[PDB]
PllA
Amino acid sequence: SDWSGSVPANAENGKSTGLILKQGDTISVVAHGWVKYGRDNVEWAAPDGPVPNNPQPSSIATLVAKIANKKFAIGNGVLHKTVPVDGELILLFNDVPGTFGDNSGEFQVEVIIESRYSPLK
Ligand SMILES: OC[C@H]1O[C@H](OC[C@H]2O[C@H](O[C@]3(CO)O[C@H](CO)[C@@H](O)[C@@H]3O)[C@H](O)[C@@H](O)[C@@H]2O)[C@H](O)[C@@H](O)[C@H]1O
Ligand SMILES: [Ca+2]
């Protein structure tokens, strides 16, 4: 993997991967494991999001990619997706701001930069 590490659910600013992406690059991601987005026994999330017996609002408590303050869905993973904007890849458990204090656990995530942008010409 270009980067492998943990994404803590309680990190309100996510986990910086150090991968500096450019528009037109392609990346793949897979994310494993389980986190809590609250203290109650039902408030569990996979990267794809809350367990559906306790749904939360759109995008909340899901694993997203933050690139230059833009957010993109990742969830359990993506394959060979084109990057739309330049920026460092930050992986984030997208809880509601200010509600990370009751979060626990971490995802195990792998990122591969499948290609760096180069046009056919
Ligand atoms: O949406 C993100 C948010 O989800 C959870 O909070 C929403 C949850 O709040 C209330 O649930 C309880 C009731 O006591 O209140 C706390 C809120 O932190 C929960 O632990 C507990 O279940 C509502 O009554 C529920 O309908 C609603 O789903 C999570 O707790 C927050 O930290 C935040 O991540
Ligand atoms: Ca929370």
Residues 1-121 form a domain with the Jelly Rolls fold (CATH 2.60.120.430). The two ends are 29 Å apart (CA to CA). The beta strands are 3-8, 15-21, 26-36, 44-46, 49-50, 63-67, 70-73, 77-82, 87-93, 104-115.
